[PDB]
């Protein structure tokens, strides 16, 4: 957070 | 076709445990974390934790460590929250929801827990506090409404706004301080950065009378404002 991680 | 279907209302004795389920459908279960949120009647939302089933990452709000346990069953695409050692202070509506605020935001319908001193957790002195100055606000149809949220520290632009109507789940309006979520009417705008954030409703309508909540997702634990109930003058 605040950015999110990819799968 | 995205769905988060929670289990039925629970009525238990102090000292018991409960396990609330959140069945996910219509997307790849592994590709999004499921968060859990506690709502007490008339009172603010609190973030419990997330489970990220794709990488088995679990993160708790320190306040709920020793009270909540999150698991996920990939075989059933179901997330579970077990609450242990229950007291009246645990009586609330619990939501599961998908992802951080942004395009994948989606909420379960909520599960009411009803439980038939000072053993609950406390917030950290380090946690961000989100202050909505007005718990109640009055307007007239066609007026401009401004709802403000002050953060206790710089949260950059990682702020969201939610609407909630009685018996319904929160609905994302704004994220990244100023970005309107898909489907939200043009009249809802967001502004702000650092410590000051505002949701503006231009040309307000009767369908807009509801509770509004800000949330910061700058840092864990994720924290919500106390809410503003917007009503008719
Ligand atoms: C990416 O990793 C973060 C932790 O750094 C979270 O677990 C997040 O949920 C992960 N994203 C996916 C899609 O699993
Ligand atoms: C952030 O967003 C992504 C999608 O792009 C995933 O849902 C990931 O799990 C999210 N992270 C958290 C912690 O919810």
Mapping DSSP onto H, E and C, the string for B65-94 reads CCCEEEEEECCCCEEEEEECCCCHHHCEEE
- Domain finish residue from B115, B140, B158: B115
> Are A4 and B30 inside 8 Å of each other by CB?
no
Assess whether B223 and B152 both reside in one domain.
Answer: yes
Range of the domain at B150: 130-227
Residues B50 and B176: their CA atoms lie apart, in Å, by 20
Name the residue facing B217 among A2, A5, A7 (closest C-beta): A2
User: Does any domain span residue B232?
Assistant: no
**SS3 at position B6:** strand
Name the residue facing B158 among A1, A5, A7 (closest C-beta): A1
**SS3 at position B93:** strand
Name the residue facing A4 among B28, B30, B99 (closest C-beta): B99
Please give the distance, rounded to the nearest whole angstrom, from the Cα atom of residue B3 to the centre of ligand 2.
17
CA of B33, closest atom in ligand 1: 9
The residue whose CA has the least distance to atom 2 of ligand 1 is A5
* CA angle (B120, B149, B45) in 5-degree steps: 30
> How deeply is B145 buried, as exposed, middle or buried, from its count of CB atoms within 10 A (0-12, 13-18, 19+)?
buried
- B189-205: b (≥16 Cβ within 10 Å) or e: bbbbeeeebbbbbeebe
**Max CA separation in chain A (angstroms):** 16
In this structure, the strands spanning B159-164 and B111-115 are unpaired
Assess whether B162 and B64 both reside in one domain.
Answer: no
- Asked if residue B110 lies in contact with residue B38, where contact means CB atoms within 8 angstroms, the answer is no
Dihedral over alpha carbons B49, B52, B58, B63 (to 10 degrees): 0
- The answer, for B58 touching chain A at a CB cutoff of 8 Å, is no
Residues B110 and B222: their CA atoms lie apart, in Å, by 19
Tally of structural domains, chain B: 2
Instruction: Please provide the DSSP assignment of B150-187 as one string.
Output: EESS--TT-EEEEEE-TTS--EEEEETTTEEPTT--TT
Dihedral over alpha carbons B101, B40, B164, B63 (to 10 degrees): -10
- Asked if residue B80 lies in contact with residue B70, where contact means CB atoms within 8 angstroms, the answer is yes
Distances (CA, A) of B140 to B91, B165, B208, B213, B232: 35, 18, 11, 20, 6
CATH number of B185's domain: 2.60.40.10
- Asked if residue B169 lies in contact with residue B95, where contact means CB atoms within 8 angstroms, the answer is yes
Distance linking the first and last C-alpha atoms of chain B: 39
For the record, the structure tokens of B167 come out as: 């018996």
Phi-psi region of B183 (alpha: psi -120 to 50; beta: other; left: phi over 0): left
Residues B59 and B51: their CA atoms lie apart, in Å, by 7
User: Does any domain span residue B164?
Assistant: yes
**How big, in percent rounded to 5, are the helix, strand and coil portions of chain B?**
5, 45, 50
**SS3 at position B30:** helix
For the record, the structure tokens of B43 come out as: 């009172």
Assess whether B148 and B212 both reside in one domain.
Answer: yes
- Asked if residue B201 lies in contact with residue B22, where contact means CB atoms within 8 angstroms, the answer is no
CA of B59, closest atom in ligand 1: 7
- Domain finish residue from B86, B115, B144: B115
The residue whose CA has the least distance to atom 12 of ligand 1 is A7
CB pairs below 8 Å between A and B: how many? 20
């Amino acid at each position: 957070a605040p950015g999110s991680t990819a799968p | 076709q995205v769905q988060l279907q929670q289990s039925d209302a629970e009525l238990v004795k102090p000292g018991a445990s409960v396990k609330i389920s959140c069945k996910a459908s219509g997307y790849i279960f592994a590709d999004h974390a499921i968060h859990w949120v506690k709502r007490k009647p008339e009172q603010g939302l609190e973030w419990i934790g997330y489970i990220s089933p794709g990488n088995d990452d679990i993160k708790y709000n320190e306040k709920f460590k020793g009270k909540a346990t999150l698991t996920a069953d990939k075989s059933s695409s179901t997330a579970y929250m077990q609450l242990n050692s229950l007291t009246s202070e645990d009586s609330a509506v619990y939501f599961c929801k998908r992802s951080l605020p942004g395009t994948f935001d989606y909420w379960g319908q909520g599960t009411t827990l009803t439980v038939s001193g000072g053993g609950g957790g406390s917030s950290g002195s380090s946690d961000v506090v989100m202050t909505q100055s007005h718990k109640f606000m009055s307007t007239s149809v066609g007026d401009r409404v401004s709802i403000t949220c002050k953060a206790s520290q710089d949260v950059g632009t990682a702020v969201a706004w939610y609407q909630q109507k009685p018996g319904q789940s929160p609905k994302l309006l704004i994220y990244w301080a100023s970005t309107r979520h898909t489907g939200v009417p043009d009249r809802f705008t967001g502004s702000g950065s650092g410590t000051d954030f505002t949701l503006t409703i231009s040309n307000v309508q009767s369908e807009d009378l509801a509770d509004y909540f800000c949330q910061q997702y700058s840092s864990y634990p994720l924290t919500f404002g106390g809410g503003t109930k917007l009503e008719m003058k």
